[model samples]
Target: HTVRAAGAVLWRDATVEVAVIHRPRYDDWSLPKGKLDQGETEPVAAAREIHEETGHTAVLGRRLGRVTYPIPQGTKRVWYWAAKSTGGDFSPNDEVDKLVWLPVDAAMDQLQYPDDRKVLRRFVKRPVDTKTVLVVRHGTAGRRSRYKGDDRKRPLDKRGRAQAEALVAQLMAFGATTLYAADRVRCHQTIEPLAQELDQLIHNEPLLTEEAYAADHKAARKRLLEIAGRPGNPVICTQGKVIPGLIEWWCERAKVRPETTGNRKGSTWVLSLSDGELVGADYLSPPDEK
Candidate 1:
């Protein structure tokens, strides 16, 4: 089996500096990364590893994607993101006793592995200093046919609630602060846990509802972008029908082309914007288990 891991090009100084860590055991320099824990998503692992290794919290930006290589045990694949470093001091540790923040080109040279360098290239090529909009398809709310009550008020099922609970770490990894949800109960319920945890209000976004999207997609795209530029990282909890159309529109505007893939219940779309414009999009359909 291919072992899964996650890491980041932890950056600072308005993207001028990049983090390079020296692992004492290997006597090698590389990007900070660690293996994923049981039931942990890549983004969650990446964020956790950043704090664990660097003693710093970060505002995660775009997905830098993944790199895979063979190792003594077997094959190891690592997922990566570009995260802006926040406040913290890097004290020496056994695993990584030394840390250096170098420029992009210099860091590429400093990294031990070619795979790490490849990930850095992807990070530099696209946008930096990006703001994020986390778009979530509401968690599973049970079967519509089985629900005797009003469909508009349909709440998340047992599994859905668990999914919502699991989403906290990943959502906060991107520093989601402001929250918005479609007016439908299921949609609102999707991000309810996050809202409560952050102690922030979840504003109702009527234009983001499936019905509203069907009526006018342009408005939803515009409103969603407006939310992106509002205050902090915005999380928009919306519907399956609405997500695809809105993403298509955003992709067109960014010249990202059409992307039709997973829009599963509890799935998330992490959209990065530079200057309030779409630059990168990542889909995270976390493992669903009862």
Candidate 2:
């Protein structure tokens, strides 16, 4: 009849946020609980179970009395305890779809299990802040015909290179560790000098190019999603075609404006894509006098 489960009262930046897991298959919210280990006490089992569910490991605190509930098998009694989490971020373990931090009132609304609701209401209370996002674009590329024969094979001209270098210098102040490019030589050439200054390599992605292929767009979008979703690493997407069409396309999918600033040559534009914010865009302009 005895069951074991654990719950942690988590705090973030002085805000009290109850750690709760969402059971997607069941369409319910429940405190993390599991079968009692042969040698483990209920409190210990509960703490372990909670850590597994919430992904936050902590020290068990004052015991909360047992809560009785019935399972398909039979009647059961679950041991619960309050605990202070020492470490671990809010992660949804394999058992749960999402690990969320909710204020006591919100937690009460979110927790579907009556016993768990009562436990949360009585013990955990408060709110937690979330992180913000800004999507920024990169700077320009060189003139197209500045190179002979193949315009597609063009590198930045002296002026365009200067612009790229200038922008790179500006980026150097930000201390970015990752650089993504659109696989085109121009995109890489535009950002490579700065990337070298920053000691980072340009990750080439053809999907971000000016071409109008859906497959390429999807690939580029996927890459952007990864870069945008990840934390800690500063990611930069140095791209081509900073026009409204491409910008709109990127914004439609990325949920942020793809700012543009870069000199273009012939039919191509140069744009920079960075996480959190979009900066610098230059349209393809005519060749400068030699």
Candidate 1 Cα misplacement greater than 4 A, ranges? 257-260, 287-290
Model 2 stretches with alpha carbons more than 4 Å out: 1-14, 124-290
lDDT of 1 by residue, 56-129 (tens): 88888888878888888899988889989888869987588999989999999899998889999998998779
Write model 2 residue lDDT over 88-162, tens digit each, in one string: 866655788887777678878877888877766545421112211212233344455465666556666576666
Kindly provide the TM-score of model 1 when superposed on the true structure, using C-alpha atoms.
0.95
Q: Least accurate stretch of 10 residues (summed lDDT) in model 2?
A: 126-135
Scored by Cα lDDT, where does model 2 land? 0.52
lDDT of 2 at 136: 25
Give the whole-model CA lDDT for all candidates, comma-separated: 0.86, 0.52
How many pairs of residues collide in model 2?
Answer: 24
TM of each candidate vs. truth: 0.95, 0.40
After the best TM-score superposition of candidate 1, give how far the Cα of residue 107 lies from its true spot, in angstroms: 0.9
